[PDB]
Amino acid sequence: MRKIGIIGGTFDPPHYGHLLIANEVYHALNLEEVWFLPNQIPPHKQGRNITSVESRLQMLELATEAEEHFSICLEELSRKGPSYTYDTMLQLTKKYPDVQFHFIIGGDMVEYLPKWYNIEALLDLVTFVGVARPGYKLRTPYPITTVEIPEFAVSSSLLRERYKEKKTCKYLLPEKVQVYIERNGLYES
Amino acid sequence: MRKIGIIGGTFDPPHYGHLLIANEVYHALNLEEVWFLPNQIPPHNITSVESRLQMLELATEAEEHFSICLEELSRKGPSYTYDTMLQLTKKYPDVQFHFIIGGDMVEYLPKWYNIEALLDLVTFVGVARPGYKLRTPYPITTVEIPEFAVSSSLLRERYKEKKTCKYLLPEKVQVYIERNGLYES
Ligand SMILES: O=C(CCC(=O)Nc1ccccc1Cl)/N=N/C=c1ccc(=C/N=N/C(=O)CCC(=O)Nc2ccccc2Cl)cc1
Ligand SMILES: [K+]
Numbered sequence: 308m309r310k311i312g313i314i315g316g317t318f319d320p321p322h323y324g325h326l327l328i329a330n331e332v333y334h335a336l337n338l339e340e341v342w343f344l345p346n347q348i349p350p351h352k353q354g355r356n357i358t359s360v361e362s363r364l365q366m367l368e369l370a371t372e373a374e375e376h377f378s379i380c381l382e383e384l385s386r387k388g389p390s391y392t393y394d395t396m397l398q399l400t401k402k403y404p405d406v407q408f409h410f411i412i413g414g415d416m417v418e419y420l421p422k423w424y425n426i427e428a429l430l431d432l433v434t435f436v437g438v439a440r441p442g443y444k445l446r447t448p449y450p451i452t453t454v455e456i457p458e459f460a461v462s463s464s465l466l467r468e469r470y471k472e473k474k475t476c477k478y479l480l481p482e483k484v485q486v487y488i489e490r491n492g493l494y495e496s
Numbered sequence: 497m498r499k500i501g502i503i504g505g506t507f508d509p510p511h512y513g514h515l516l517i518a519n520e521v522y523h524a525l526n527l528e529e530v531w532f533l534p535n536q537i538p539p540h541n542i543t544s545v546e547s548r549l550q551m552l553e554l555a556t557e558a559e560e561h562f563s564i565c566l567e568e569l570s571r572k573g574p575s576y577t578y579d580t581m582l583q584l585t586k587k588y589p590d591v592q593f594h595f596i597i598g599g600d601m602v603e604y605l606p607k608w609y610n611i612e613a614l615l616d617l618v619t620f621v622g623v624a625r626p627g628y629k630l631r632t633p634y635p636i637t638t639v640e641i642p643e644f645a646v647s648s649s650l651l652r653e654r655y656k657e658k659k660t661c662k663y664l665l666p667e668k669v670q671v672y673i674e675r676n677g678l679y680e681s
């Protein structure tokens with residue numbers, strides 16, 4: 308069975324923090340590849356902006372393009388609305404019978420796993436890989452894998468605000484992403 | 497209509513980080529009260545419900561505007577937040593519930609069970625560090641919270657290593673933990 312990691316999120320925008328996490332799990336668990344799984348976003352409720360599927364996808368391409376062992380999985384992005392991880396992984400299991408999935412989650416996510424839709428059935432579809440700060444451990448009734456990664460603290464929520472202020476995010480995300488964002492005036496709001 | 501906060505988790509153990517967040521939301525939104533909502537942990541080493549409730553009681557005994565809400569512990573498996581809020585809105589029709597979530601949770605809200613229906617039962621409050629702007633298509637309130645990097649994960653390992661956690665959670669909770677050997681492993 309091919310060992311394939313999954314890292315999901317809206318990647319809005321993708322940055323070095325995402326890359327570092329995917330990379331650390333790739334090396335730590337000796338995966339064949341890591342697939343980035345861009346989430347769908349429902350239309351805004353009160354006339355504000357959501358970054359387009361096309362824009363988020365293009366940034367993700369630019370962010371990952373150079374690393375042979377990263378790819379983009381379009382399973383959720385191709386759907387009209389958001390997906391429960393269970394439904395997504397059921398589909399990927401159908402599409403790729405020879406693949407073993409390692410689904411990467413943040414350390415803070417671990418204690419809330421029991422509230423995920425169809426969690427018991429999901430555990431039969433994937434192996435969770437929780438990210439912990441060096442030296443420390445995640446606690447869950449569930450059989451999960453733990454990978455230690457330093458907390459690098461880069462966040463999409465901080466980057467967007469910089470762009471809104473017409474600052475650069477050079478050195479916080481791949482140069483190609485920076486060039487694409489400032490050009491298209493993303494995150495100006 | 498009363499404004500009441502909810503902060504949910506396994507509180508395993510509760511710590512200054514939890515109290516700080518509950519307090520900041522309490523002050524920022526001028527809430528009447530904040531209820532700590534202990535989660536059920538399903539069987540599949542798990543900290544007993546009794547020990548977690550005891551810690552939560554010890555953590556909140558000093559603070560006037562912090563209460564414990566047992567709604568989730570009163571059911572057997574796990575509860576979706578939707579299930580819980582359906583019951584609390586029924587029990588307290590006169591309450592406007594503000595459900596507090598970590599900043600990092602906000603981008604994944606669309607994946608929460610029955611999110612649209614839940615949006616009619618709660619006002620989400622996302623907490624974030626200075627300079628973070630949370631982004632969601634859903635109508636949520638934001639609260640800036642100071643950074644104190646304490647986590648239950650960090651505390652459990654210190655206790656395993658027999659290190660003190662003085663200054664990281666209430667003295668009474670530490671003593672309960674140490675006496676009971678909760679995280680010795
Ligand atoms: O695909 C995924 C995640 C992928 C991912 O994990 N990528 C990833 C990969 C690598 C690194 C990082 C990341 Cl994020 N989607 N998961 C969907 C969820 C469904 C249900 C959930 C239930 N939450 N219930 C609550 O009551 C939470 C309360 C709370 O938030 N308390 C709170 C209060 C104050 C402060 C802090 C906190 Cl926590 C949570 C998530
Ligand atoms: K690539």
Ligand SMILES: [K+]
Nearest residue numbers: 536571574575
């Ligand atoms: K429950």
